[PDB]
Amino acid sequence: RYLQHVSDLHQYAKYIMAALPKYIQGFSVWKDELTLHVAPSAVIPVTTFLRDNTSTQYKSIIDITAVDYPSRENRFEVV
Amino acid sequence: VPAHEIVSGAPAELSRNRVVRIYQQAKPATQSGEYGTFAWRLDWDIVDVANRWENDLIGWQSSGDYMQATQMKFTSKESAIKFANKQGWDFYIQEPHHRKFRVKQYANNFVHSYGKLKHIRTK
Amino acid sequence: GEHALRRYPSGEERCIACKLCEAICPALAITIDAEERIDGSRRTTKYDIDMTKCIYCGYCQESCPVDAIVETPNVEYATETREELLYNKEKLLANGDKWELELQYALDADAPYR
Amino acid sequence: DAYDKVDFDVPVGMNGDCYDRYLIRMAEFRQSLRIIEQCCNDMPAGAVKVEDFKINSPPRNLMKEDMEALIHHFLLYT
Amino acid sequence: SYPTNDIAENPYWKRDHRRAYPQTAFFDQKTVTGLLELGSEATPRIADGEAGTKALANIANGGVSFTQALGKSSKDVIYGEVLTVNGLPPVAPTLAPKQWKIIEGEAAIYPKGYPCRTFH
Amino acid sequence: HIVSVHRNTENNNPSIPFEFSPENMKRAEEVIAKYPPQYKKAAVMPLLDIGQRQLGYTSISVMNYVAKLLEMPPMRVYEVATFYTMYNRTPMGRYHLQICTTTPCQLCGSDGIMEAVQNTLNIKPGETTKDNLFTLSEVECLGACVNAPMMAINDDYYEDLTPEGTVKLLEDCKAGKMPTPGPENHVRRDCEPASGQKVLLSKEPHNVADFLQEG
Amino acid sequence: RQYGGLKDQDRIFQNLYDNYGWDLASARKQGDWYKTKELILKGDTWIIDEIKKSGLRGRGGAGFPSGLKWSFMNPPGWEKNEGPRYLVVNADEGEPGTCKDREIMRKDPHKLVEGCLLAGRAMNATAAYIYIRGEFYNEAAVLQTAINEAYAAGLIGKDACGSGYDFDVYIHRGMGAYVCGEETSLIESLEGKAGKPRLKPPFPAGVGLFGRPSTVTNVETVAVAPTILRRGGDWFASFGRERNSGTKLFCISGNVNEPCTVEEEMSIPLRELLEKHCGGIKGGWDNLLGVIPGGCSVPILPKNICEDVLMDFDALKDVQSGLGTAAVIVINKQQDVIRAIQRFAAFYKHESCGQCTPCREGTTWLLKAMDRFRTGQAKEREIDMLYELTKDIEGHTICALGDAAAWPIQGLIRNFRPEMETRMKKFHDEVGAVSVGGWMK
Amino acid sequence: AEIELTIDGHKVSIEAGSALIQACEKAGVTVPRYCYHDKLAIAGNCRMCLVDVERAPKPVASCAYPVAPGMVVRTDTERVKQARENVMEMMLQNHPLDCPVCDQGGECDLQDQSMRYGRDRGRFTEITGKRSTEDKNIGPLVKTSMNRCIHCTRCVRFANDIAGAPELGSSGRGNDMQIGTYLEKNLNTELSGNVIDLCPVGALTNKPY
Ligand SMILES: Cc1cc2nc3c(=O)[nH]c(=O)nc-3n(C[C@H](O)[C@H](O)[C@H](O)COP(=O)(O)O)c2cc1C
Ligand code: SF4
Ligand code: SF4
Ligand code: SF4
């Protein structure tokens, strides 16, 4: 099950990148967790697509935060 | 270089009094591992009067310096130096000292000495 | 409840200056000064718990290999100054003196589950 | 955490008011009493900590007698 | 229990799970073009093992684009590995799917008249 | 067992002197000449042997003095005569009992041999006799495995022993002037079967000169 | 092709029994030093190509083809080293079971001296040192007189046999260390250090003794060398199997009726050997519990296997065992195997040099385990724990002494598990039950 | 003058004739060790850096196996992980329970390395127990507790090779091997408090404090 399911999550996210190539830079999965790697001027359209599509309707912000790595030129990453 | 010492909320004295130091941590001479010798440590040189002093009741090591236990880890020297002069600090980059490559053979442990032996291995 | 430094039978301090209870404490209450005598054995010149900042996790009991510090089940020790609340070595050896038989009983009854 | 292996209903109200949040709480008392009874009856025998000792502590029985468990104890705590 | 601390046959590395940890499958903009054009280790589209690496390396250098990779993609590619086999977008996937009962009769925890239902 | 740390009480000092006997000094020069003129340190093994011949044991004085002779630091002699069984660094008596206890001696009764010996004396297998005459030592395989129970006085292996016949040889050595010829109690010459010679039953050799390869 | 029972005209050693005399002149009558000039005046290539045809394996215990071994001596640029190079005779044989270092060299030393010369010619070897076990003082008094006879006859020395070739033989006596029987511990002992082994990829043929190229041969594989050069090589190859060729002296000791040292063919049946020259086992063929081919460093063959087994390298390697030195130690049915292997473990604890941590720590560990298992102070699990500790020691050592310490334990666990179980059930009846590590309850 | 080979799938180029542990250090592959040091001679005592090498029957010691071309080196073979657990387990059987009182608490090489490769459990529970090997005086600068020694020869390799004080040594065979002078004599060299940061365990440490 779980091997099949993580292989399914990979394919879903490949679809999400192919549907919006202008905004999504990357995606990474690590153990049934999906991270979408997005530019800062690219926040609002991707979040409308995540709220609004019927395949992709997330509807509910849980928690957001930043994390600093001072060793990068763009310091904070907002998740 | 944008001067970010006025936006980070740090006081002025932390930018115009104290010197800071870039260094890579050296390999420990005690144990033979090398894991902590890849990241670049940003650490503050101590101040004269406010480092540490003994308490009178028990003997607690009370301090007045507040950056005494802060360190940072960076990936590269360039990221560390861009962060150091972006916050407006006075650094000192300490360059690392590696080991020299020298070819070793186990067959070095015995060769035919033609003159004086001048040495006796033990193994 | 309040701390105590135990002793051996035939009278011996049992804290071997091994420094584990200081390294584990999630609030940094322990402060130990360690010195070695001519005999080769190890003890503590200065043992110290700040009880304004001890938080009662019992990790210090769990870490000491020789079972030298424990948690006596006393709670009725409320004081009137903070300088009374800084426990040095002498106060905790006195607490290990007074609470001993109930302490040993509790550790012996606890000892299968540890 | 073996909430999978234990039978459990969930209460969900109709109106969004404050009475229904009260009413769902009143139901969750009963659901949790049900879980406590099933956990008492379906309790097995086993180890309670994880099997290895590079992430949690050795028992103080054999922390002493073994050399390696002494080593592991000291490194998990320092 | 005893099978964890037997004295005969316990190498630590067989019961070892901290080191056999998965890695984050990070995917660039460019390695997805590689997935669309080179193919896959399941379905490769590459012969000529010497000229394979040469066809790989321009994509690895930034030869073709991703919108170009989508325009050059066949309908079999798009309905096999981008979309589902029926031409549908994939559903946001869930690990253990949860199908709901509604308990209604005397086994309910509130009778009719109270607004709380007791789903399962 | 091996015990390696040296105690410095009495009769084992760097201060007590030692010199070669002139016959021993001539033999020492002869043995140093066997090796290349560089590696004269290689003559550390059979020369503390010479020290074991002149003095009854290998003192610290003989090892210091052979270290002085061969241009060596003394620890390089110290390691060599510590690593070896046969340099007995403790004083013994005159006759060194070397009774073999390895399984080919054991499957044919070296237990009874050792029991007869240490019932005749009263000492332990690391103990010497208070008369300073005999010194027990249980020892491993001396190479006489077919002569299935055996032992060794200082250089001469004595073999094929019976526990009744052994205590005879023990009092023979105790009385002074009675050694055996070197072999056992005359049951065979060196290694033949005990019934007799099954094979090589020819009075004369056959030469290899008629049996040649020709090229 | 019934292997065994060769003729009196076949035996390479004739002086095994004190009949023909070990004298120089008596060795002339035996056939020694007969055509030495012609063999030395012929090149090394012909001697090495002759010893390759016979299939002379190594008689030290390793079992290596000696022609290949002597061909590592000459890389095609062997000349430009331009110093002294030589050969080492491993006349140390202190192995439990064997008696053959004494039986070459208190019986016929002149075959050894000419074997040294006739092999060092093939090795382009300027000298030779012979390493005698220092227990043998009597033998060291014999061999030096034989070498002085060969010096006085002018056969060896500055001008060996009028061939323009110099060759020096010296005697080195090793004061009692069985780890020095290993070839590189032998090298370090002849160098004058403590006799510990060194590691493999500085091969002794490449850089060996005194930093000069030198290899190490057993006293037998060099004492057979002059006769096999005088006889035909294809005559030597007519015995044993195809790969296992020729003869070998056999020391049969232990609890036989008549312990003896014979010399016979390889690839022979064990039972025929024991009937022909021991007179049978003391109590009949019913009275075997096990047999050990070779020294102590070989696993035990049990009763049903040792009926139809051949005495070469192949038919013992196939039953997971070694030919060793072909010492044959049988074990009484009325006597303990656990005693016979506890003694081997204590032997290896006394005789380990102590260099690498698994061998030095391990035979101490195995001796504690066997002293526990002999009284029976164990649980049923701990003997396969001991098997795991054998695999812990086995493949991870400098020399093969840790390899040698692995093997008898493996023979015990594979062949005598119910005997150990029986002793442990006896201990469980006599006194109380026992925890792990021998602790009681 | 250089040699290309493969370690752990990485390819690496090192000067000819070097040791394999230097190629593993160059490629970034972490290989455990106890008796190897960058400034000392090579010995194969400690038996830790055993490594899987194609065209080799046994795992070879990577500190003294010289570099040859076309070399395929694997370090994550299950035989290698078994080998490291085995050797560590052998090391830890009469090493004494001294970590509460040892000097090298958080700096012990043997202790950090019994986590990354060591076995979880220890079977040494024999009655007759540990070896003792009671210690000996050296000088007023080097505290000596030889029970904790693991016989890595590194102290005596140093005092022979570079310090030039050949007094140290290894006297014994098998279990009764000791390290050090056994005259009870004083280790003098002008750089002598240097053997204590060299010993990987806490056998030779600071005496003055
Ligand atoms: C611990 C150990 C002890 C050995 N003892 C002997 C011995 O006593 N006599 C011998 O001939 N070979 C002995 N060997 C085998 C030697 O290494 C042998 O000389 C070499 O491997 C092969 O020499 P060869 O070609 O003459 O057979 C021993 C090997 C080891 C590992
Ligand atoms: S109980 Fe907790 S906070 Fe208190 S001394 Fe112990 S570890 Fe520290
Ligand atoms: S109480 Fe325990 S941890 Fe603290 S110093 Fe004493 S022995 Fe160490
Ligand atoms: S196998 Fe044992 S005796 Fe041999 S070198 Fe290794 S540690 Fe020493």
Ligand code: SF4
């Ligand atoms: S040196 Fe040994 S005893 Fe001391 S702390 Fe380290 S592992 Fe423990």
Ligand code: SF4
């Ligand atoms: S004294 Fe220290 S450095 Fe020397 S071998 Fe022993 S443990 Fe290693």
Ligand code: FES
């Ligand atoms: S077995 Fe006892 S001497 Fe050979």
Ligand code: FES
């Ligand atoms: S470090 Fe390579 S084995 Fe000792």
